Amino acid sequence: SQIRQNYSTEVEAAVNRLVNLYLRASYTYLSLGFYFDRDDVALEGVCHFFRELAEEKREGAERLLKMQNQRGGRALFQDLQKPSQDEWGTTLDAMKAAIVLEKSLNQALLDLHALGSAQADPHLCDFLESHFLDEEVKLIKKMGDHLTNIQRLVQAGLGEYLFERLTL
Amino acid sequence: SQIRQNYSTEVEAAVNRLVNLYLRASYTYLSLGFYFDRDDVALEGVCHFFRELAEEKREGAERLLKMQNQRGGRALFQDLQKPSQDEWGTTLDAMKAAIVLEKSLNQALLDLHALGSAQADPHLCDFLESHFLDEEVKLIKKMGDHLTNIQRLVQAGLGEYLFERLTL
Amino acid sequence: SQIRQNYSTEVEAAVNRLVNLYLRASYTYLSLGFYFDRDDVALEGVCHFFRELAEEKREGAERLLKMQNQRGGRALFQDLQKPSQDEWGTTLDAMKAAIVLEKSLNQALLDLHALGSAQADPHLCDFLESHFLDEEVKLIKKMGDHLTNIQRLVQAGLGEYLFERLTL
Amino acid sequence: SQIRQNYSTEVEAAVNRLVNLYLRASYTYLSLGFYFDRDDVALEGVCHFFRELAEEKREGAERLLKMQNQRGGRALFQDLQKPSQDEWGTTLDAMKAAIVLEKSLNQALLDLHALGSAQADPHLCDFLESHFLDEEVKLIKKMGDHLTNIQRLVQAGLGEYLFERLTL
Numbered sequence: 001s002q003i004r005q006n007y008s009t010e011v012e013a014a015v016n017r018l019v020n021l022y023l024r025a026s027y028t029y030l031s032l033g034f035y036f037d038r039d040d041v042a043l044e045g046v047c048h049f050f051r052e053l054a055e056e057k058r059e060g061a062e063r064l065l066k067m068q069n070q071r072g073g074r075a076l077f078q079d080l081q082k083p084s085q086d087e088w089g090t091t092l093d094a095m096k097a098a099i100v101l102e103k104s105l106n107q108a109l110l111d112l113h114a115l116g117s118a119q120a121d122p123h124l125c126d127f128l129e130s131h132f133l134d135e136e137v138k139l140i141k142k143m144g145d146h147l148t149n150i151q152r153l154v155q156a157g158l159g160e161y162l163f164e165r166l167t168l
Numbered sequence: 169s170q171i172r173q174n175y176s177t178e179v180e181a182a183v184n185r186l187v188n189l190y191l192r193a194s195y196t197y198l199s200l201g202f203y204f205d206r207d208d209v210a211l212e213g214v215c216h217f218f219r220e221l222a223e224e225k226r227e228g229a230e231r232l233l234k235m236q237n238q239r240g241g242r243a244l245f246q247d248l249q250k251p252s253q254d255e256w257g258t259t260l261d262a263m264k265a266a267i268v269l270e271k272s273l274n275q276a277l278l279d280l281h282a283l284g285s286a287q288a289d290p291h292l293c294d295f296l297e298s299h300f301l302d303e304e305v306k307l308i309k310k311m312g313d314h315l316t317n318i319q320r321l322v323q324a325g326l327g328e329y330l331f332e333r334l335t336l
Numbered sequence: 337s338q339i340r341q342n343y344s345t346e347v348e349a350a351v352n353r354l355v356n357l358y359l360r361a362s363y364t365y366l367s368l369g370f371y372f373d374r375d376d377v378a379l380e381g382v383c384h385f386f387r388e389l390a391e392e393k394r395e396g397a398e399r400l401l402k403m404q405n406q407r408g409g410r411a412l413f414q415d416l417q418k419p420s421q422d423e424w425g426t427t428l429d430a431m432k433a434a435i436v437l438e439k440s441l442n443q444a445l446l447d448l449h450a451l452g453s454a455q456a457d458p459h460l461c462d463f464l465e466s467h468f469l470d471e472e473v474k475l476i477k478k479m480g481d482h483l484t485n486i487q488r489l490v491q492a493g494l495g496e497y498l499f500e501r502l503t504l
Numbered sequence: 505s506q507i508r509q510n511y512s513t514e515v516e517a518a519v520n521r522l523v524n525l526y527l528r529a530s531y532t533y534l535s536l537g538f539y540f541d542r543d544d545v546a547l548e549g550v551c552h553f554f555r556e557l558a559e560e561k562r563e564g565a566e567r568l569l570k571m572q573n574q575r576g577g578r579a580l581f582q583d584l585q586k587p588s589q590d591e592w593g594t595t596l597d598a599m600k601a602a603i604v605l606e607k608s609l610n611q612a613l614l615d616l617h618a619l620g621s622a623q624a625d626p627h628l629c630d631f632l633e634s635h636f637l638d639e640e641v642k643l644i645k646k647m648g649d650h651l652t653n654i655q656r657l658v659q660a661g662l663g664e665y666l667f668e669r670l671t672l
């Protein structure tokens with residue numbers, strides 16, 4: 001590539017893997033969202049919370065794809081594995097799965113940052129710090145807050161309704 | 169009729185029967201609405217929900233009557249049978265009866281559509297599709313959502329109050 | 337399902353397959369878009385054209401998912417197969433692949449419509465007609481127009497630049 | 505210096521060298537710009553593109569000078585070597601020289617960042633990341649895009665005119 005400079009093949013490959021992780025996270029949130037839209041689940045606040053996250057993850061993937069091209073790397077796409085569940089249980093179950101998902105995305109970001117630092121690639125490191133690392137920390141804090149409130153509310157039916165009505 | 173074209177006597181008669189069904193549904197919702205306005209029931213959100221449906225059903229009947237005349241059919245009215253109950257029990261009971269009512273209206277629409285298709289009457293089929301079929305599907309989805317939330321809330325008194333306050 | 341009415345298992349399954357097709361089409365357009373954003377391809381108008389289609393296909397999938405739930409069907413997601421190519425060649429090559437993709441989506445819509453008609457499911461038939469069938473016809477006409485103009489422009493480098501600058 | 509803290513003599517000297525590189529880049533772009541303003545070259549879009557870059561590089565030098573003073577380092581200026589060419593050939597030739605220039609500035613930034621990291625100087629590292637590193641990556645991507653389009657357009661006279669008219 002005419003523009004490629006200080007951009008290792010290792011980082012390029014890792015960025016492609018991170019794109020896959022973000023697209024798969026987006027897919028997972030799409031499924032979560034429409035599950036809460038079921039007539040026999042019917043928690044619109046929860047549906048909206050996850051649909052919004054689906055959009056955020058898709059946007060993250062696209063930001064990574066843009067950066068790949070900016071650096072002269074080449075996007076390679078793989079199959080997107082279907083989400084791990086077809087039915088997501090309670091808001092509590094769903095929020096727990098969401099935090100597990102985000103911690104896995106965060107660890108991937110941290111791993112990529114460590115790789116970038118090993119490869120002496122400050123642009124990559126800065127890119128991750130300004131657009132992904134703090135966003136993950138904030139989102140995980142928020143999910144933790146939600147989990148704590150959901151748990152304190154478990155008359156579980158009553159609690160699940162109130163949380164959706166008054167928090168989401 | 170000078171204007172009548174491709175409008176079968178079967179469809180004309182069926183449209184008159186559907187008008188009766190819609191007027192009777194409207195009457196049912198009128199009764200539901202004022203029941204929840206009783207000082208010993210006192211659920212204003214529920215009253216409003218049903219009063220609004222009474223207006224929607226009356227409007228549906230009038231749209232059918234307009235179409236009857238547009239096609240050169242002749243409106244024939246029959247007695248409107250009084251609603252099936254004088255007292256409607258809980259919000260849960262009432263919402264269950266409402267969904268039963270709407271499924272019966274929907275089936276009547278589907279039957280009329282099948283008749284129109286058998287009579288090769290595309291105007292009728294289109295009329296039902298654009299003004300009634302999707303509205304029924306949407307309303308039934310909403311009622312199902314409400315039923316699910318009411319059920320999850322059953323401290324039944326507390327649940328009935330919260331649903332009326334926070335959903336309706 | 338409490339709300340499900342006149343919604344066959346065949347249609348429910350077919351709607352799930354159509355969701356997969358739309359998500360995969362979206363994925364294909366994502367890849368097409370970022371390919372034209374490569375520094376060694378550099379056709380921004382073409383990139384934007386495909387990115388916009390990626391969004392349209394994702395939106396189509398979500399509309400189908402909403403309808404699935406409205407009817408009381410259950411969303412089931414499968415793996416999303418990666419796009420058929422990693423590199424998309426010329427604008428001409430890409431536009432040809434796009435029209436092949438859209439014709440395949442259109443045929444799937446037509447097949448689902450035929451199924452709905454066989455199952456006497458007028459809501460499904462109307463849903464497809466008002467939100468998908470005409471949109472496909474319009475998009476395919478536009479792609480055909482583009483293909484014709486690209487072909488008339490093939491000094492192929494010059495033609496590809498002018499088309500991107502003056503049409504897209 | 506009363507304010508100097510964690511600011512190595514090595515970094516101070518390197519920052520002075522980077523100032524020289526940026527001022528020289530600015531000078532190079534000044535020459536490029538006025539070359540395309542010649543009556544026998546006459547490509548106003550190209551002239552403007554380079555004049556704007558001259559201003560950007562001068563602004564970069566001044567930002568570095570400000571930071572030098574903020575940290576308590578002392579600005580030292582050296583002779584500015586004249587640009588490497590008096591006449592810049594085609595837009596293609598000029599854009600190639602511009603990308604060579606920017607890669608050399610980028611490498612200097614990367615070298616300074618590595619030095620800052622070795623000296624454990626996080627303020628320097630952050631300063632470079634937020635104001636220079638991403639700007640270089642973006643500019644180099646843009647130049648690569650331009651080069652690709654210019655090359656696809658080479659009727660070379662025709663191509664050079666069209667690129668200036670429709671891109672710049």
Ligand SMILES: CCC[C@@H](C)C1(CC)C(=O)NC(=O)NC1=O
Nearest residue numbers: 026027054055058359362366394
């Ligand atoms: C918001 C959900 C994202 C979905 C639609 C998904 C992958 C499934 C995505 O993340 N990005 C796309 O460009 N297309 C898609 O289909």
Ligand SMILES: CCC[C@@H](C)C1(CC)C(=O)NC(=O)NC1=O
Nearest residue numbers: 527530531534558559561562565
């Ligand atoms: C925009 C061109 C910059 C020129 C004018 C140059 C060095 C030649 C500069 O970069 N900064 C200045 O302060 N003066 C100058 O003359």
